[PDB]
Symmetry: D2
């Protein structure tokens, strides 16, 4: 409950950590598509939004960037919220996979919602029946509520490039169709289209931190008081972000940082400190694992300083 004693002083520490992370210039900006290669390796922003509704930003916190995989926890939350744990998990697993890297697990289901095959299946469960345009509007609405109506855009350029370039996602798409992993009567190619769109949704560190804070606040948006996601949805999302949100670094991350988080190839890291605050770190240069270098650094420092680790 009693988060941080003095928020203003906490703010001062965020800035120090931010400054320290700024010195980390390693990594490479994703470049499989021009829309990602465009970004400057020097962009670096950190936005905080407590359960209180208190805000604080430092760095490039108003420059829009694509959620990419950061959207995975979000659409999963939405699915559980509208369909419940039981139904959703008839189509997707609940744990980290081994590491080469099969699309399905022992039961012919994607290992979890945080890997592509999983996110693709989860995408096929949301608002079934209506057209893609409607489904897309539906999720945008949902993301707006989580962000307390702050910035939520869309990158058509990214969407177009992701589609006419995601051969691997199509491989996954057909494979899942082959294994009957989708709900009866699913238009697979149409689902991949919806999936590419969701990955192309844009946010800023500021609006994203509010989304994170909503998850940190048991499903209530810290700046509107509104209930956006069901308790069940939030807990599931957090559990999976804890164990599968940082790609191949998930294990190390859970051990050293101990916080629910989710990274994206755009350089973002959606971080959550349960009952305390939500955060969004962003910096285009990624490491071998695919996580934002400055972001990973900052997260370690934050936990070592404020003792935020799940088991402190």
């Amino acid at each position: 409950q009693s988060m941080i004693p003095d928020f203003m002083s906490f703010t001062s520490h965020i800035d120090e950590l931010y400054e320290s992370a700024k010195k980390q210039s390693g990594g490479k900006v994703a470049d499989y598509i021009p829309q990602l290669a465009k970004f400057s390796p020097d962009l670096w922003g950190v936005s905080v939004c407590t359960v209180d509704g208190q805000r604080h930003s430092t760095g490039d916190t108003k420059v829009p960037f694509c959620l990419q995989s950061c959207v995975k926890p979000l659409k999963y939350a939405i699915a559980v919220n509208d369909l419940g744990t039981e139904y959703v998990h008839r189509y997707v697993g609940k744990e980290p996979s081994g590491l080469n890297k099969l699309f399905l697990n022992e039961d012919d289901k994607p290992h979890n919602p945080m890997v592509n095959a999983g996110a693709i299946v989860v995408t096929s469960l949301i608002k079934q029946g209506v057209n893609n345009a409607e489904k897309f509007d539906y999720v945008m609405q949902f993301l707006n509520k989580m962000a307390g109506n702050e910035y939520v855009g869309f990158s058509n350029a990214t969407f177009q490039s992701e589609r006419e370039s995601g051969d691997r996602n199509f491989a996954i798409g057909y494979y899942l169709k082959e294994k009957k992993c989708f709900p009866e009567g699913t238009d697979m190619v149409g689902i991949l289209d919806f999936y590419f769109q969701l990955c192309s949704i844009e946010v800023t560190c500021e609006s994203a931190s509010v989304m994170a804070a909503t998850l940190a606040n048991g499903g209530f948006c810290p700046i509107t008081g509104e209930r956006v996601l069901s308790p069940e949805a939030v807990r599931n999302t957090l559990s999976l972000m804890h164990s599968c949100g940082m790609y191949d670094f998930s294990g190390q991350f859970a051990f050293h940082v101990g916080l629910p988080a989710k990274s994206g190839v755009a350089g973002g890291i959606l971080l959550v400190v349960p009952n305390v605050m939500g955060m969004m770190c962003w910096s285009p240069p990624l490491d071998k694992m695919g996580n934002s270098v400055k972001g990973i650094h900052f997260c370690h420092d934050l936990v070592s300083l404020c003792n935020f680790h799940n088991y402190d």
Copy 2:
């Protein structure tokens, strides 16, 4: 050189083995598409064609059926014949894979030409540049020469069903595209189309046995004297049929039968006894491994009786 002493007497033994195999009624006729489910489980034919040009058939040896995977050795032979060992193998491996069942190997190449991913890549190497209609005519011509101009048809029904149903081959198709496994400028979807057509080519035990005899005769068609395939092509094809031609039964088959062979889901088994004869066994009911039950039985008996095993 000195094959079998008396061919007429050998013929009498073929009939006995054929009759013995006829008692084996186990297995299930493939049924993932209606064109295969249609077949009667009782169809059973065995055609022999020696290096001499001597023929002999017993059973349903004139009922057309699709080559399916039996065409894999054949198109591979063609590729090596027109492009040479070195070039072809820049795109496909030369050995059996482990067993779950990755599309690519350590070097991002399909393990060998006998598995789907391999056959698909091999298909992309033949007669590059021309349209599919032309490529198809080209291979048909080639198959005719191997069969000494005997029956070589095409099943449009099978082709159509294979296409609008091969989700797994499409998964493989996109995956290979993703890993840059095809030659520069390959139209992947167009290649899968050519691949489905090749699998739909029809033969009879009689015309197929002539094809096998051509491979048994170092590349010369036993009934026309013509050189159809280069020595290099024939040896490669035989080596791979020896180790990867019977799906997951390849190991057992190489150990107990010791002959170059290739099975197909239609129930066919293209068998080759180097410098002696070519054969084609056919019977729709397959076992767990996917091989023709009567066919597998007959092959074991043939080797136990005539001591045809590679190492006798």
Copy 3:
């Protein structure tokens, strides 16, 4: 901080859950050795020990049983406590493995301290230099402090049976020696002996719950006020128990229960509710995964009722 409002009332709920679990009669009592087969499938005990020092038991909470794998978290805590995170992890990983089931990971290290290969390596790090008798006394002392000097015995019968029967642990032992996984100059066979002894240490639900409470209390024994383990040791142990403490059920467990726990083939389940209490459930009949049936049931019920899940 504010654990449960009224402990006496909480006690009443424990008894209800205990009674409910009692109806679950499935599973099989381990029987690879007679010392385990001896146990009655009806034994069922649950002991609670809060951070306050408040106690409560129900069922067979005074019948001694072997820790078996339950000792893994405990000796790991000890290693980190005396050697620090960095040193210990030069020899053992920090995450769940895939699932067949290799002894080592990508870096030739046991995946984590909760699997046999890991526990064996961890065992080789404790009190290096002294003889086994001394090492054993050292750990017993440590376990006594964690249990606030309550019951901590030893089963010579189990120890003897485990040794002259653990062919697989010996396979692991030699393999690790082969891969130079032990500290310079380690007597491998001697280490396996120490390992078998540690698995043979006996506790009761009551003394074990105190051990769990010590971990729940940041390293301080709830009934002596003494500092037994360093904060670093406790946090590491808890993180790994969260992700690797329930064998192949770890994933499901982390998702549905969300609590640090560790099971043992004797039927015990060391459970920990951070900053609230420690617990020890015990019931010999195990499920396919190897976890106590009644124990697994009880744990699910406890979290569904008291909302103890890490992310509630």
Copy 4:
């Protein structure tokens, strides 16, 4: 039947190939034990022994060296010869494994007799009941018959070093014991001892080539006319040498050379040309795969020149 036209001229070609291979100075002499590191990288010998009984040697063909893995085909032949295909294969598989590298396969049996786990199991089947000294004498006798009584020694130094250093073979030993892979009442540690001895048996290129010729001659020693191995034994051995005799190079070897062969860490390569001749190439420097560099080179050249490939 009609091997090579003129043997004397063939001899002249062997010398040319031998000379050509001599220029290949790559590779590293095994050095996990001093008894192997001792060898000069320049040693290079090639001995030929036809089915006729005609001999020819070039290079260091009288310098003794350990069979090491070259003994695997030989003891397997012996097992099949005394127990028959059926019995032997209740304990060991018949095919190449995948590639990390599990000790057992799907049925809990070593994949084949050519890998360590397999050879160890095969070793436990020979002359059961008698003591190791007797078993050893028994196999020595057998090897003498295959070598037409030519050089067959023993390296006690190698044996001692292999034992007090084969941690991995012990891991395999205990693992197999754990999976009940040995015949009822097998003294596992005693079997590993017999296994280390068999690997320490010494031969020269000359005596080994005679052993190979015996296999090439359907089980009859070319220089004594005696029947040493049953036809069944020889065919099985050859089939497995064809597919599993060159470690991880087996696939490539079967494709490009197409001859039954078996390599050893001492630098030897037991080669067999069915119904023509037996050979033994030896040169201490091995490649990444573990095969003799000069040996591999020579074998390729031999087949390209004399068209000895199984499918020429």
